[PDB]
């Protein structure tokens, strides 16, 4: 096969992979997609960065506020009102807060598929989103910043930022499972090492991007 | 054989194993369900992740409860109202409280296949059907959260959350025992090392999750 200089996406990548493993037979190609579904997962299982982050409003309603399907991990959480940050704790503490009602430091916790907040908050969303209402961002309610499970590819012309930015990664990491389907293990080691060494670059990029501007270790607030 | 790209059912996985373990013969394919059963039992023996959790209402008669047959490991349990997270103690400690005890916290322990409670709690199951549009919870009930063993497939088109999330997890682990039937000793380590790599990949996705919101200290003081 052949490809274009940039590999925008699947429609070409699933071929370039066959290429980089020169012997592209059918028993092998038709599982290309599977190798890929493996690799992206092996990645996203632990990769965390902005581009997949999300803004979103919530509906607390009795503090049963439910967790979205797409959720993986939360970075921060707050209100659109006066910018109040929540913080997180365990049930074993929030329950005490309940048995000791008197609330400014808002806490919350993870009860199965549920989020609890100590004070009976009432942020809100509309009913199912037929919508017909921006509603000042749903009454400027809490807003969440969380990493979300990206969609598995399902189409050749389908795409993702990753390919705009860092496709060789996917290539190597799927070659990994491709060189496992058929026993060429030295190639495996090489693919894998390179995937990891490509990857850690990204997280370090992000780390060096985070906390820039020389902040003090912690502005000690008295109040 | 041939398999689809979105491997999601036990039926396709059974043929996918015969594809990656490329051999297809009566001496091998007929035992594949046993290999999958071996792989899942090994994985579920120690894996603890939220999607396999379960909510349940108890039937406390007099400070006692019978452990559900599907119970594996216990986590937080609380009252349906006002919270009051329960805590576990030893039989040698709860018995001390009974004889000397003639707002208080709640402690519980395990007597073989039974639960016990010091304050002699009485809880009841939901009132259940009739017209059966809702399932109305009853007052003075308790809610328990525990890890339950997922049912064995025992059926082709049956599916599980593991296949949806990490299909390669069971695929590599069942290749371990597949390479145990025929002594592909080199294959044993490669599937296992990849298998634990995927298996261990589960946990840091989870511990980075329960403490993701805002890592702080312990704001629980007695006052």
């Amino acid at each position: 096969p052949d490809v274009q200089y940039p590999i925008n996406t699947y429609g070409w990548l699933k071929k370039a992979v066959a290429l980089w493993a020169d012997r592209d037979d059918d028993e092998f190609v038709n599982q290309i997609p599977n190798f890929i579904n493996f690799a992206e997962k092996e990645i996203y299982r632990n990769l965390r960065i902005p581009p997949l982050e999300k803004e979103v409003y919530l509906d607390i309603k009795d503090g049963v506020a439910y967790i979205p399907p797409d959720y993986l991990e939360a970075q921060w959480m707050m209100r659109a009102k006066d910018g109040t940050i929540f913080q997180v704790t365990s049930p074993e503490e929030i329950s005490y807060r309940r048995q000791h009602g008197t609330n400014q430091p808002v806490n919350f916790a993870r009860f199965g598929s549920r989020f609890i907040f100590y004070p009976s908050i009432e942020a809100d969303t509309p009913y199912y989103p037929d919508d017909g209402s921006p509603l000042i961002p749903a009454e400027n309610s809490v807003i969440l910043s969380y990493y979300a499970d990206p969609p598995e590819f399902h189409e050749d012309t389908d795409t993702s930022t990753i390919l705009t930015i860092a496709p060789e990664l996917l290539l190597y990491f799927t070659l990994r499972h491709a060189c496992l389907f058929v026993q060429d293990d030295n190639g495996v080691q090489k693919w894998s090492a390179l995937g990891k060494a490509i990857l850690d670059e990204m997280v370090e990029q992000n780390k060096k991007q985070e906390y820039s501007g020389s902040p003090i270790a912690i502005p000690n607030n008295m109040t | 054989p041939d398999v689809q790209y979105p491997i999601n059912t036990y039926g396709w996985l059974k043929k996918a194993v015969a594809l990656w373990a490329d051999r297809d013969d009566d001496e091998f394919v007929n035992q594949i369900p046993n290999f999958i059963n071996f792989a899942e039992k090994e994985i579920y023996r120690n894996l603890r992740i939220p999607p396999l959790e379960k909510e349940v209402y108890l039937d406390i008669k007099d400070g006692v409860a019978y452990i559900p047959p599907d119970y594996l490991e216990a986590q937080w349990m609380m009252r349906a109202k006002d919270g009051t997270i329960f805590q576990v103690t030893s039989p040698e400690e709860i018995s001390y409280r009974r004889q000397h005890g003639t707002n208080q916290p709640v402690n519980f322990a395990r007597f073989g296949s039974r639960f016990i409670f010091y304050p002699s709690i009485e809880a009841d199951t939901p009132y259940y059907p009739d017209d059966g549009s809702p399932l109305i919870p009853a007052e003075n009930s308790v809610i328990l959260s525990y890890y339950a063993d997922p049912p064995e497939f025992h059926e082709d088109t049956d599916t599980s959350t593991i296949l949806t999330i990490a299909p390669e997890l069971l695929l590599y682990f069942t290749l371990r025992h597949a390479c145990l039937f025929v002594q592909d000793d080199n294959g044993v380590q490669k599937w296992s090392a990849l298998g634990k790599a995927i298996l261990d990949e589960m946990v840091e996705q989870n511990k980075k999750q329960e403490y993701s919101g805002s890592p702080i200290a312990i704001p629980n003081n007695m006052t």
Partner: peptide
């Protein structure tokens, strides 16, 4: 008053069943 997170498919079954009866008697 916080609800637990059981299987999503079961909640979807409760979601549609109650919605179907509510909207049908609504009609």
């Amino acid at each position: 008053s916080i609800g637990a997170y059981k299987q999503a498919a079961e909640y979807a079954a409760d979601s549609k069943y109650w919605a179907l009866l509510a909207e049908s008697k609504f009609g």
